Coordinates of C-alpha atoms and ligand atoms in Angstrom, one line a residue:
Chain A
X8 CA -19.5 288.8 -30.4
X9 CA -16.2 290.1 -31.5
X10 CA -13.4 287.9 -32.5
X11 CA -10.8 290.2 -30.2
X12 CA -11.6 289.6 -27.1
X13 CA -9.9 290.2 -23.5
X14 CA -9.2 286.9 -21.3
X15 CA -11.6 285.9 -18.7
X16 CA -10.9 286.8 -14.6
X17 CA -9.6 283.3 -13.2
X18 CA -7.5 282.5 -10.0
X19 CA -4.2 283.2 -11.9
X20 CA -5.6 286.5 -13.7
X21 CA -6.9 289.4 -11.5
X22 CA -6.7 292.1 -14.2
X23 CA -8.1 291.0 -17.8
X24 CA -6.3 291.9 -21.0
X25 CA -7.0 292.7 -24.5
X26 CA -4.7 292.1 -27.5
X27 CA -2.2 294.7 -28.4
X28 CA -2.2 294.7 -32.6
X29 CA -0.4 296.4 -34.8
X30 CA -3.0 298.7 -37.1
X31 CA -0.8 296.9 -39.9
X32 CA -1.8 293.5 -38.9
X33 CA -4.9 291.7 -40.4
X34 CA -7.0 289.7 -38.0
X35 CA -9.7 287.6 -40.6
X36 CA -12.9 287.7 -38.9
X37 CA -13.0 284.0 -38.4
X38 CA -10.1 284.0 -36.4
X39 CA -10.3 284.1 -32.7
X40 CA -7.2 286.1 -30.6
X41 CA -8.2 286.2 -27.0
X42 CA -6.4 287.6 -23.9
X43 CA -2.5 288.8 -23.1
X44 CA -1.0 289.0 -27.3
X45 CA 1.1 291.3 -29.0
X46 CA 0.8 291.0 -32.6
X47 CA 3.7 293.0 -34.7
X48 CA 3.3 294.8 -37.7
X49 CA 2.6 293.6 -41.2
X50 CA 1.7 290.1 -39.7
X51 CA -1.5 287.8 -41.1
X52 CA -3.8 285.7 -39.2
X53 CA -5.8 283.4 -41.2
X54 CA -9.2 282.1 -41.0
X55 CA -9.9 279.7 -38.4
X56 CA -7.0 280.4 -36.4
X57 CA -6.7 280.7 -32.8
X58 CA -4.7 282.5 -30.4
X59 CA -5.8 282.1 -26.8
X60 CA -3.6 284.1 -24.0
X61 CA -6.0 283.0 -21.1
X62 CA -3.8 280.4 -19.5
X63 CA 0.1 280.9 -19.5
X64 CA 0.5 284.4 -20.9
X65 CA 1.9 286.5 -22.6
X66 CA 1.6 285.3 -26.6
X67 CA 4.0 287.3 -28.9
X68 CA 4.0 287.0 -32.5
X69 CA 6.7 289.5 -34.4
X70 CA 6.5 291.3 -37.2
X71 CA 6.1 290.1 -40.8
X72 CA 5.1 286.8 -39.2
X73 CA 2.1 284.5 -40.3
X74 CA -0.3 282.6 -38.3
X75 CA -2.2 280.4 -41.1
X76 CA -5.5 278.8 -40.9
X77 CA -6.4 276.7 -38.2
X78 CA -2.8 277.4 -36.3
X79 CA -3.6 277.3 -32.4
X80 CA -1.4 279.3 -30.4
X81 CA -2.0 278.1 -26.2
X82 CA 0.5 277.8 -23.2
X83 CA 0.4 275.9 -19.8
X84 CA -0.2 278.2 -16.7
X85 CA 2.8 280.7 -16.0
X86 CA 1.1 281.7 -12.5
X87 CA 0.6 278.9 -9.5
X88 CA -1.7 278.4 -6.7
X89 CA 0.0 281.3 -4.5
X90 CA 0.6 283.3 -7.3
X91 CA 3.9 281.9 -7.8
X92 CA 5.4 282.4 -10.9
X93 CA 5.8 278.9 -12.7
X94 CA 9.3 279.0 -14.2
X95 CA 9.4 276.1 -16.2
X96 CA 6.4 277.3 -18.5
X97 CA 7.9 280.6 -19.2
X98 CA 10.4 281.2 -21.8
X99 CA 13.1 283.9 -21.8
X100 CA 13.6 286.2 -25.0
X101 CA 15.4 288.9 -25.2
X102 CA 15.3 289.5 -21.4
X103 CA 11.7 289.4 -21.8
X104 CA 9.6 286.8 -20.2
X105 CA 6.7 284.8 -22.4
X106 CA 4.7 282.0 -22.7
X107 CA 4.9 281.6 -26.4
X108 CA 7.2 284.0 -28.3
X109 CA 7.1 283.8 -31.9
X110 CA 9.9 285.9 -33.2
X111 CA 9.8 288.0 -36.3
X112 CA 9.9 286.8 -40.2
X113 CA 8.3 283.4 -38.6
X114 CA 5.4 281.3 -40.6
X115 CA 3.3 279.4 -38.9
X116 CA 2.1 277.3 -41.6
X117 CA -1.7 275.5 -41.9
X118 CA -3.0 273.7 -39.1
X119 CA 0.5 273.7 -37.3
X120 CA 0.5 274.4 -33.3
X121 CA 3.0 276.2 -30.9
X122 CA 2.2 275.3 -27.3
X123 CA 3.8 277.3 -24.3
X124 CA 6.2 277.1 -23.2
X125 CA 7.5 277.7 -26.3
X126 CA 9.9 280.0 -28.4
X127 CA 10.5 280.1 -32.4
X128 CA 13.2 282.2 -33.5
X129 CA 13.3 284.5 -36.2
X130 CA 13.0 283.6 -40.0
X131 CA 11.8 279.9 -39.2
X132 CA 9.2 278.0 -41.1
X133 CA 6.6 275.6 -39.0
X134 CA 5.1 273.7 -41.8
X135 CA 2.1 272.3 -42.2
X136 CA 0.3 270.0 -39.2
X137 CA 3.7 270.3 -37.4
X138 CA 3.8 270.7 -33.5
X139 CA 5.8 272.3 -31.0
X140 CA 5.7 272.3 -27.5
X141 CA 8.1 272.9 -24.4
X142 CA 10.8 273.9 -27.0
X143 CA 12.7 276.4 -28.2
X144 CA 13.2 276.5 -32.1
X145 CA 16.2 278.5 -33.4
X146 CA 16.6 281.1 -36.1
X147 CA 16.6 279.9 -39.5
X148 CA 14.9 276.6 -39.0
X149 CA 12.5 274.4 -40.9
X150 CA 10.2 272.2 -39.4
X151 CA 8.7 270.3 -42.3
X152 CA 5.1 269.3 -42.5
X153 CA 4.1 266.7 -39.4
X154 CA 7.2 267.0 -38.0
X155 CA 7.4 268.0 -34.1
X156 CA 9.8 269.3 -31.4
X157 CA 9.1 268.2 -27.9
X158 CA 11.0 269.1 -24.7
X159 CA 13.8 270.0 -26.7
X160 CA 16.0 273.0 -28.0
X161 CA 16.4 273.0 -32.1
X162 CA 19.7 274.8 -32.6
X163 CA 19.8 277.7 -35.2
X164 CA 19.7 276.3 -39.0
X165 CA 18.6 273.2 -38.6
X166 CA 15.6 271.0 -40.4
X167 CA 13.4 268.2 -38.7
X168 CA 12.5 265.8 -41.4
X169 CA 8.4 265.6 -42.3
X170 CA 6.9 263.2 -40.1
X171 CA 9.8 263.0 -37.5
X172 CA 8.9 263.4 -33.5
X173 CA 11.9 264.9 -32.1
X174 CA 11.4 264.7 -27.8
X175 CA 15.2 264.1 -27.0
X176 CA 17.7 266.7 -26.8
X177 CA 20.6 264.0 -28.3
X178 CA 18.1 263.6 -31.6
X179 CA 17.8 267.6 -31.8
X180 CA 21.6 268.0 -31.4
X181 CA 21.8 265.6 -34.5
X182 CA 19.3 266.9 -36.5
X183 CA 20.4 268.1 -40.2
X184 CA 21.8 271.5 -41.0
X185 CA 19.5 273.7 -43.8
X186 CA 21.8 274.6 -46.9
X187 CA 21.0 276.0 -50.4
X188 CA 19.9 272.9 -51.6
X189 CA 18.0 271.8 -49.3
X190 CA 14.7 271.2 -50.5
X191 CA 13.0 274.1 -48.3
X192 CA 15.9 276.6 -47.8
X193 CA 14.0 279.4 -49.6
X194 CA 10.8 278.6 -48.7
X195 CA 9.9 280.8 -45.6
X196 CA 11.4 284.0 -47.0
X197 CA 8.9 283.5 -50.1
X198 CA 6.1 282.7 -47.6
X199 CA 6.9 285.6 -45.7
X200 CA 6.8 287.9 -48.8
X201 CA 3.5 286.5 -49.9
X202 CA 2.2 286.5 -46.7
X203 CA 2.8 290.5 -45.8
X204 CA 1.5 291.2 -48.9
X205 CA -1.8 289.0 -48.1
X206 CA -2.1 291.0 -45.0
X207 CA -2.0 294.2 -47.0
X208 CA -4.1 293.2 -49.8
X209 CA -6.7 291.9 -46.9
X210 CA -6.1 295.1 -44.9
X211 CA -7.6 297.0 -48.1
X212 CA -10.7 295.3 -48.0
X213 CA -12.0 295.7 -44.3
Chain B
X8 CA -26.8 282.3 -37.6
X9 CA -26.6 280.2 -34.7
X10 CA -23.7 278.4 -33.6
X11 CA -25.5 275.9 -31.1
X12 CA -28.0 274.3 -33.6
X13 CA -30.2 271.2 -34.8
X14 CA -29.1 268.5 -37.2
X15 CA -30.4 268.4 -40.4
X16 CA -33.4 266.1 -41.5
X17 CA -31.7 262.8 -43.3
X18 CA -33.2 259.6 -44.0
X19 CA -31.8 258.3 -40.8
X20 CA -32.7 261.5 -38.6
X21 CA -36.0 261.9 -38.9
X22 CA -36.7 263.9 -36.0
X23 CA -34.1 266.3 -35.7
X24 CA -32.4 267.3 -31.7
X25 CA -30.9 270.1 -30.3
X26 CA -27.9 270.2 -28.2
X27 CA -28.4 269.7 -24.4
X28 CA -26.0 271.7 -22.9
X29 CA -25.8 272.3 -18.7
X30 CA -26.1 276.0 -17.9
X31 CA -22.4 276.1 -16.1
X32 CA -21.4 274.9 -19.6
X33 CA -19.5 277.8 -21.9
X34 CA -19.8 277.3 -25.3
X35 CA -17.4 279.6 -27.1
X36 CA -18.9 281.9 -29.9
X37 CA -16.8 280.3 -32.5
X38 CA -17.0 276.7 -31.7
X39 CA -20.2 275.1 -33.6
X40 CA -22.3 272.3 -31.6
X41 CA -24.9 270.9 -34.0
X42 CA -27.3 268.1 -33.3
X43 CA -28.0 265.2 -30.6
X44 CA -25.3 266.3 -28.1
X45 CA -25.0 266.3 -24.6
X46 CA -22.7 268.5 -22.9
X47 CA -22.3 268.1 -19.3
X48 CA -21.3 270.7 -16.2
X49 CA -18.6 273.1 -16.2
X50 CA -17.4 272.1 -19.7
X51 CA -15.7 274.4 -22.0
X52 CA -15.6 274.0 -25.6
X53 CA -13.0 276.5 -27.2
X54 CA -12.5 278.4 -30.1
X55 CA -12.7 276.3 -33.6
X56 CA -14.1 273.2 -31.8
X57 CA -16.8 271.1 -34.0
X58 CA -19.1 268.7 -32.2
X59 CA -20.9 267.4 -34.9
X60 CA -24.0 265.0 -34.4
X61 CA -25.7 264.8 -37.7
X62 CA -24.5 260.9 -38.7
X63 CA -23.5 258.9 -36.0
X64 CA -25.6 260.1 -32.5
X65 CA -25.6 260.4 -29.6
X66 CA -22.1 262.7 -28.9
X67 CA -21.4 263.3 -25.2
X68 CA -19.0 264.8 -23.0
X69 CA -19.3 264.5 -19.4
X70 CA -18.9 266.5 -16.7
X71 CA -15.6 269.0 -15.9
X72 CA -14.6 267.8 -19.2
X73 CA -12.8 270.3 -21.7
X74 CA -12.8 270.5 -25.9
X75 CA -10.1 272.8 -26.9
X76 CA -9.6 274.8 -29.8
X77 CA -10.1 273.0 -33.1
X78 CA -11.0 269.8 -31.5
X79 CA -13.4 267.9 -33.7
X80 CA -16.2 265.3 -32.5
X81 CA -17.8 263.3 -35.3
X82 CA -19.1 259.8 -35.9
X83 CA -19.8 257.2 -38.2
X84 CA -23.4 256.3 -39.2
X85 CA -25.5 254.9 -36.2
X86 CA -28.6 253.8 -38.5
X87 CA -28.7 251.9 -41.9
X88 CA -31.0 251.4 -44.9
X89 CA -34.1 249.9 -43.5
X90 CA -33.4 252.0 -40.3
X91 CA -31.5 249.1 -38.8
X92 CA -28.8 250.5 -35.8
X93 CA -25.3 249.5 -37.0
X94 CA -24.1 248.0 -33.9
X95 CA -20.6 248.3 -34.7
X96 CA -20.8 251.7 -35.3
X97 CA -22.7 252.1 -31.5
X98 CA -20.6 252.0 -28.1
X99 CA -22.1 250.8 -24.8
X100 CA -21.0 252.8 -21.6
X101 CA -22.8 252.4 -18.4
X102 CA -26.0 250.3 -20.4
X103 CA -26.0 253.8 -22.6
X104 CA -25.6 253.5 -26.1
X105 CA -23.3 256.2 -27.7
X106 CA -21.6 257.0 -31.0
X107 CA -19.2 259.3 -29.2
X108 CA -18.9 258.9 -25.4
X109 CA -16.4 261.6 -23.8
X110 CA -16.6 261.1 -19.9
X111 CA -16.0 263.3 -16.9
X112 CA -12.9 265.4 -16.2
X113 CA -11.3 264.3 -20.0
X114 CA -9.3 266.9 -22.1
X115 CA -9.4 266.8 -25.2
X116 CA -6.4 269.0 -26.0
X117 CA -6.0 271.3 -29.1
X118 CA -6.7 270.0 -32.8
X119 CA -7.4 266.6 -31.5
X120 CA -10.2 264.7 -32.7
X121 CA -12.0 261.9 -31.3
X122 CA -14.3 260.0 -34.2
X123 CA -17.1 257.6 -33.6
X124 CA -17.4 254.8 -32.8
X125 CA -15.2 255.8 -29.9
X126 CA -15.2 256.2 -26.5
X127 CA -13.1 257.9 -23.7
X128 CA -13.2 257.0 -19.9
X129 CA -12.8 259.4 -17.3
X130 CA -9.5 261.2 -16.4
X131 CA -7.9 260.6 -19.4
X132 CA -5.9 263.4 -21.4
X133 CA -6.1 263.1 -25.1
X134 CA -2.6 264.9 -26.2
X135 CA -2.6 268.0 -28.8
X136 CA -3.0 266.6 -32.5
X137 CA -3.8 263.2 -31.2
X138 CA -6.7 260.8 -32.9
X139 CA -9.1 258.5 -31.4
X140 CA -11.3 256.4 -34.0
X141 CA -13.1 253.1 -33.6
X142 CA -11.6 252.7 -30.2
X143 CA -12.2 252.4 -26.4
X144 CA -9.7 254.5 -24.1
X145 CA -9.9 253.6 -20.9
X146 CA -9.8 255.6 -17.6
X147 CA -6.6 257.5 -16.1
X148 CA -4.7 257.0 -19.6
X149 CA -2.9 259.5 -21.1
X150 CA -2.7 260.1 -25.3
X151 CA 0.5 262.1 -25.8
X152 CA 0.6 264.7 -28.5
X153 CA 0.3 263.0 -31.7
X154 CA -0.6 259.8 -30.6
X155 CA -3.2 257.7 -32.2
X156 CA -5.7 254.7 -31.3
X157 CA -7.6 253.2 -34.3
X158 CA -9.5 250.0 -33.8
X159 CA -8.2 249.5 -30.2
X160 CA -9.0 249.2 -26.7
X161 CA -6.5 250.9 -24.7
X162 CA -6.6 249.5 -21.1
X163 CA -7.1 251.8 -18.0
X164 CA -3.6 253.7 -16.9
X165 CA -1.7 253.5 -20.1
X166 CA -0.2 255.7 -22.0
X167 CA 0.5 256.2 -25.8
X168 CA 4.2 257.8 -26.5
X169 CA 4.3 260.8 -28.7
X170 CA 3.5 259.9 -32.5
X171 CA 3.0 256.8 -32.0
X172 CA 0.0 255.0 -34.1
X173 CA -1.5 251.8 -32.3
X174 CA -3.6 249.7 -34.7
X175 CA -3.6 246.7 -33.4
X176 CA -4.9 245.1 -30.2
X177 CA -1.8 243.4 -29.5
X178 CA 0.3 246.7 -29.5
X179 CA -2.7 248.2 -27.3
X180 CA -1.8 245.3 -24.6
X181 CA 1.7 246.6 -23.9
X182 CA 1.4 250.0 -24.1
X183 CA 3.1 251.2 -20.9
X184 CA 1.5 252.4 -17.3
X185 CA 1.1 255.7 -15.8
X186 CA 3.0 255.7 -13.0
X187 CA 4.0 258.8 -10.6
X188 CA 7.2 259.6 -12.3
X189 CA 5.9 259.4 -16.0
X190 CA 6.1 263.1 -17.4
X191 CA 2.2 263.2 -18.2
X192 CA 1.3 261.3 -14.8
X193 CA -0.1 264.7 -13.3
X194 CA -1.1 266.6 -16.5
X195 CA -4.9 265.7 -17.1
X196 CA -5.7 267.1 -13.6
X197 CA -4.0 270.2 -13.6
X198 CA -5.6 270.6 -17.2
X199 CA -9.1 269.9 -15.8
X200 CA -8.6 272.6 -13.0
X201 CA -7.6 274.8 -14.9
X202 CA -10.3 274.3 -17.9
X203 CA -13.1 274.4 -15.4
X204 CA -12.1 277.8 -13.9
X205 CA -11.6 278.8 -17.5
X206 CA -15.3 277.9 -18.4
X207 CA -16.6 280.0 -15.2
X208 CA -14.9 282.9 -15.9
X209 CA -15.8 283.1 -19.7
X210 CA -19.4 282.7 -18.2
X211 CA -19.0 285.8 -16.5
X212 CA -18.2 287.9 -20.0
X213 CA -21.1 286.5 -21.7
Chain C
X8 CA -18.9 290.1 -42.1
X9 CA -19.3 287.2 -45.4
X10 CA -17.8 283.7 -44.9
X11 CA -17.9 283.4 -48.9
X12 CA -15.6 286.3 -50.1
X13 CA -13.5 287.5 -53.0
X14 CA -9.5 287.3 -52.6
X15 CA -7.5 290.4 -52.2
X16 CA -5.9 292.6 -54.7
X17 CA -2.0 291.6 -54.5
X18 CA 1.2 291.8 -57.3
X19 CA -0.3 288.4 -58.4
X20 CA -4.0 289.2 -58.3
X21 CA -4.8 292.4 -60.1
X22 CA -8.2 291.3 -61.0
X23 CA -10.3 289.6 -57.7
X24 CA -12.2 286.8 -57.9
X25 CA -15.7 285.4 -55.7
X26 CA -16.3 281.8 -55.7
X27 CA -18.4 280.2 -58.2
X28 CA -20.7 277.5 -56.1
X29 CA -23.6 275.6 -57.2
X30 CA -26.6 276.7 -55.7
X31 CA -26.9 272.5 -54.6
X32 CA -23.9 272.8 -52.5
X33 CA -24.0 273.4 -48.8
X34 CA -21.6 275.9 -47.4
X35 CA -21.8 276.0 -43.4
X36 CA -21.7 279.6 -41.8
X37 CA -19.1 278.8 -39.6
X38 CA -16.8 277.6 -42.9
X39 CA -14.7 280.2 -44.9
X40 CA -14.4 280.1 -48.8
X41 CA -12.3 282.9 -50.2
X42 CA -11.2 283.4 -53.9
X43 CA -10.7 281.7 -57.2
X44 CA -12.5 278.8 -55.9
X45 CA -15.3 276.6 -57.9
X46 CA -17.4 274.0 -55.8
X47 CA -19.4 271.7 -57.6
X48 CA -22.9 270.3 -57.2
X49 CA -23.9 268.4 -54.0
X50 CA -20.5 269.4 -52.2
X51 CA -21.0 269.7 -48.5
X52 CA -18.3 272.3 -46.7
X53 CA -18.4 271.4 -42.7
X54 CA -17.9 273.8 -39.9
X55 CA -14.3 275.4 -39.8
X56 CA -13.4 274.6 -42.9
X57 CA -11.1 277.1 -44.7
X58 CA -10.7 277.1 -48.5
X59 CA -8.3 279.9 -49.8
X60 CA -7.7 280.6 -53.0
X61 CA -5.7 284.0 -52.6
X62 CA -2.1 282.7 -53.3
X63 CA -2.1 279.6 -55.7
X64 CA -5.4 279.7 -57.9
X65 CA -8.1 278.3 -58.9
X66 CA -9.0 276.0 -56.1
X67 CA -11.7 273.3 -57.7
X68 CA -13.7 270.9 -55.8
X69 CA -15.7 268.3 -58.2
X70 CA -19.3 267.4 -57.8
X71 CA -20.4 265.0 -54.7
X72 CA -17.5 265.8 -52.8
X73 CA -17.1 267.0 -49.1
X74 CA -14.7 269.4 -47.1
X75 CA -14.8 268.1 -43.8
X76 CA -14.7 270.3 -40.5
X77 CA -11.3 272.0 -39.9
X78 CA -10.2 270.9 -43.6
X79 CA -7.4 273.3 -45.1
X80 CA -7.2 274.3 -48.8
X81 CA -4.4 276.5 -49.8
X82 CA -1.8 276.8 -52.2
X83 CA 1.3 277.7 -53.5
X84 CA 1.8 280.7 -55.7
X85 CA 1.1 279.8 -59.0
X86 CA 2.1 283.3 -60.3
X87 CA 5.9 284.6 -60.0
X88 CA 7.7 288.3 -60.0
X89 CA 7.1 289.4 -64.0
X90 CA 3.8 287.7 -63.8
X91 CA 5.3 284.1 -65.0
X92 CA 3.0 281.3 -64.3
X93 CA 4.9 279.1 -62.0
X94 CA 4.6 275.6 -64.1
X95 CA 6.0 273.5 -60.9
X96 CA 3.2 274.9 -58.6
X97 CA 0.5 274.2 -61.5
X98 CA -1.3 271.0 -61.9
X99 CA -3.1 269.8 -65.0
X100 CA -6.4 267.7 -65.2
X101 CA -8.2 267.2 -68.1
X102 CA -6.6 270.0 -70.1
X103 CA -7.0 272.4 -67.3
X104 CA -4.7 274.1 -65.0
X105 CA -5.4 274.3 -61.1
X106 CA -3.3 275.0 -58.0
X107 CA -5.5 272.6 -56.3
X108 CA -8.0 270.1 -58.2
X109 CA -10.2 268.1 -55.6
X110 CA -11.9 265.3 -57.9
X111 CA -15.6 264.2 -57.7
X112 CA -17.1 261.5 -55.0
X113 CA -14.0 262.9 -53.0
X114 CA -14.0 262.8 -49.3
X115 CA -11.4 265.0 -47.3
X116 CA -12.3 264.1 -43.9
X117 CA -11.8 265.9 -40.6
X118 CA -8.5 268.0 -40.0
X119 CA -7.0 266.5 -43.0
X120 CA -5.3 269.1 -45.6
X121 CA -4.8 269.2 -49.3
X122 CA -1.8 271.9 -50.1
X123 CA -1.1 273.0 -53.7
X124 CA 0.4 272.1 -56.3
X125 CA -2.0 269.3 -55.9
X126 CA -4.5 266.9 -57.2
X127 CA -7.0 264.1 -56.0
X128 CA -8.6 262.0 -58.3
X129 CA -12.1 261.0 -58.0
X130 CA -13.4 258.4 -55.6
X131 CA -10.8 258.8 -53.3
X132 CA -11.0 258.8 -49.6
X133 CA -8.6 261.1 -47.6
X134 CA -8.6 260.1 -44.0
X135 CA -8.6 262.2 -40.8
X136 CA -5.7 264.5 -40.4
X137 CA -4.2 263.3 -43.6
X138 CA -1.5 265.5 -45.6
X139 CA -1.5 265.8 -49.5
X140 CA 1.2 268.7 -50.9
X141 CA 3.0 268.5 -53.9
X142 CA 1.5 265.3 -54.9
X143 CA -1.1 263.9 -57.6
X144 CA -3.2 261.3 -56.0
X145 CA -5.0 258.6 -58.2
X146 CA -8.8 258.0 -58.4
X147 CA -9.9 255.3 -56.3
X148 CA -7.6 255.7 -53.3
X149 CA -7.4 255.8 -50.0
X150 CA -5.2 257.7 -47.3
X151 CA -5.8 256.3 -43.9
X152 CA -6.0 258.5 -41.0
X153 CA -3.1 260.8 -40.2
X154 CA -1.2 259.4 -43.9
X155 CA 0.9 261.8 -45.8
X156 CA 1.8 262.1 -49.7
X157 CA 4.4 264.7 -50.3
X158 CA 6.2 265.3 -53.5
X159 CA 4.6 262.0 -55.2
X160 CA 2.7 260.5 -57.2
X161 CA 0.2 257.8 -55.6
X162 CA -1.3 255.4 -58.8
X163 CA -4.5 254.7 -58.9
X164 CA -6.1 252.4 -56.6
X165 CA -3.6 252.3 -53.9
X166 CA -3.8 252.8 -50.3
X167 CA -1.4 254.8 -47.8
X168 CA -1.3 252.7 -44.2
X169 CA -2.6 254.8 -41.0
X170 CA 0.6 257.3 -40.1
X171 CA 2.8 256.8 -42.9
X172 CA 4.6 260.0 -44.7
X173 CA 5.3 258.8 -48.3
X174 CA 8.0 261.4 -49.8
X175 CA 9.7 259.4 -52.3
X176 CA 8.2 258.3 -55.5
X177 CA 10.0 254.4 -55.1
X178 CA 7.9 254.3 -51.7
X179 CA 4.3 255.6 -53.5
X180 CA 5.2 253.0 -56.5
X181 CA 5.0 250.5 -54.2
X182 CA 2.1 251.4 -52.0
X183 CA -0.4 248.3 -51.1
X184 CA -3.9 247.9 -53.6
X185 CA -7.5 248.8 -52.4
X186 CA -9.1 245.1 -52.8
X187 CA -12.6 244.3 -51.6
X188 CA -11.3 242.9 -48.3
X189 CA -9.6 245.8 -47.4
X190 CA -10.8 247.7 -44.1
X191 CA -11.4 251.0 -45.9
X192 CA -12.6 249.4 -49.2
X193 CA -16.0 250.3 -49.3
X194 CA -15.4 253.6 -46.8
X195 CA -15.6 255.9 -49.5
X196 CA -19.0 255.4 -51.4
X197 CA -20.7 255.6 -47.4
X198 CA -18.9 258.7 -46.7
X199 CA -20.2 260.5 -50.3
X200 CA -23.7 259.0 -49.7
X201 CA -23.9 260.2 -46.4
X202 CA -22.4 263.5 -47.2
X203 CA -24.7 264.6 -50.3
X204 CA -27.8 263.3 -48.1
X205 CA -26.2 266.2 -45.6
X206 CA -26.0 268.6 -48.1
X207 CA -29.6 268.7 -49.1
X208 CA -30.5 268.6 -45.3
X209 CA -28.4 271.2 -44.4
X210 CA -29.5 273.2 -47.3
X211 CA -33.6 272.9 -46.0
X212 CA -32.2 274.7 -43.0
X213 CA -30.7 277.8 -44.5
Ligands
CO301 CO1 -3.2 274.7 -24.3
CO302 CO1 -16.7 262.2 -39.8
CO303 CO1 -0.3 277.7 -47.7

C-alpha cells in the first residue's frame, strides 16, 4: 500500500486528485497524505500524521511548515447535494479557496488538529494537543498546548493560554498579545529552524 | 505484517480471536484492528485509528458508524485472576455484554477516544479530541470537541459543551438538550452520510 | 521501510544513533521508534505510538513501562548553535542526562504525550490524553485523563484531577495526595501487570 494516495470517488468528488508535494518536503513512511493536498517546500510531515483531503478540499500546507506526530488535517464538506459549493465551509486566503489553509513557517505540534473550515496564518505555533476548527488564526500567533479556537477569528500576534477553549468572538478579541518577554515568543522560529533541518536530514535517508 | 490481527494469548485470553468485519466496511491500511472486535456494515476506519481488543473484550462498532483518524478504542480487563468476569468493567447493551459498545450511526471524530467500560448509543456524535471512559452515552447525543464523560451516564438527547469534563452524575443529569437550533443538532447525520459514502469510495480503491 | 530507525544527520547530530531495545520489549509494527532511544525490559509499545529522539536526546523508557496507542515522546533541542548543550532542556535523573526520562513501571496511557525536557518517576500513571512538558513528575503519581503538567515539579505521591492544567509551582505544591481510597490508587499496578503480560503475549506472535 502507498501512504501518499488519491482520494476516492464520491458524489462530491467526480475526479479524484493526488497530493502535489514539493520534492524538498519529507513525508514519513508512517504518515498518511490523501487527496487534494498541496505540500510546500521544506515541509516535514512526521510519523502518524494524517492529512486527509477527501471531504472538504483542498488542504494546503505552506513552505517551511511542519505537521508533527499524530497531527490530523481534515475538513467539512465543501460541495453540497446538487454540487453546490458550501461557502460556510470554505476559507479564502490571498484570493484562493481552501478547506484547510496552513500558511508558511507554521508549526502544527504533536497531536494537534486543524479541521476545516480553517486557516492558520504564517509564523504561528499551534501547540501540542491544540485544536483549531471553523476558525481563522492570524499570523504570528501562539496557541499554547491544549488551547482551542472554535468558530472564531484570532487576531494577528495574539496567544491562547494553555488549556483555554475559545468559542466566542468576544473572547478572541480580548486574547493577550505576544511580546518579547512572553514565554513562547521565540518558540515558533526555533521550531521552524529545527524542522526545516530535520526534513533535509530525513530526506537524505530515503 | 497485517493490520487486522488476532489478539495475543494471555492469562485472561486462552483462545485468541480475530476481528469479525463486514465485507462492506473499509479498514484503512494504516489503521490497526486487533482481537475480539466486531465491525458492522458500511463502517469507515480511518488512518491511524487503533481498535485494540486484547485486555477488556469484546469491542463492537455498529453499522454505519465511523472511527476517524487517530481514534483509539481499548478497554479495562474484563476477566480477573481466577478468570472471574469483572462485572464493573463490562457494559450491557440489548442483553449482550461488551467491553466497548459503539452503536449504529455513531461518529467517533478525529483523535477522540472511547475506553471501556463504555457504551455509546446510536446517532451520537463524539467530537474531535473528546473522551469517553467508564460511561454510558445515550443515543442522539453530542459530545462537542474536547468534551469528556468519565464515570457517568449521559441521558439521551443531551450535549456536552466544548472543553467540559463531566465526572459526576449530578452534572451529567443537568446537561443541556439537543434542539433543532443547537449548533451541532444536524452534525451527526451529515457526518454519517459522508462517511458511509467514503467507506464505499475507499472500498472501490482496494 | 523499517519502523525502528536511526535519527537523521543534522547540525546537532553528527553521529546518528539507533534505538537500544531490550529483547524482551515488544514494539508494535505500527509504532515508530527513531533515534537515540533506550527501551527497557518487558516494555510494550502499542500501535500508533511515536517515540522520536531526533531533536532533544536521549529518550529513555524504563523497565516494565508501557507506551500506549498514539502516545508521542519528543523533546526540545538539547544542543545549541556552537554545539552548546542547552541545560534548560536537559533533565538529570540518577546522575545521567536525558531529554525525556520515563522511569520503571510507568504507564503512558492512550493518546498521552510526554515532551522534553521532562522526567516521569517510577510507578506513575499518565492518564489517557494527558500532557507532560517541561516538568518533573515524581514517583507514585497519577495524572488523571486530560490533566496536564507544564513548567512544574509534581511531588511524589500526588494526583492531578481530570482536565486540570497545572502551569504554576504554587498549584503543583497543593495537588492532592494519592491515598488507598482514591479512585486511581490501584490503577497503575494493575496496568503494569496487564501490559507486561501483553508484551510477552505479543512477543510470542512475532
Ligand atoms: Co473531519
Ligand atoms: Co487501555
Ligand atoms: Co517536539
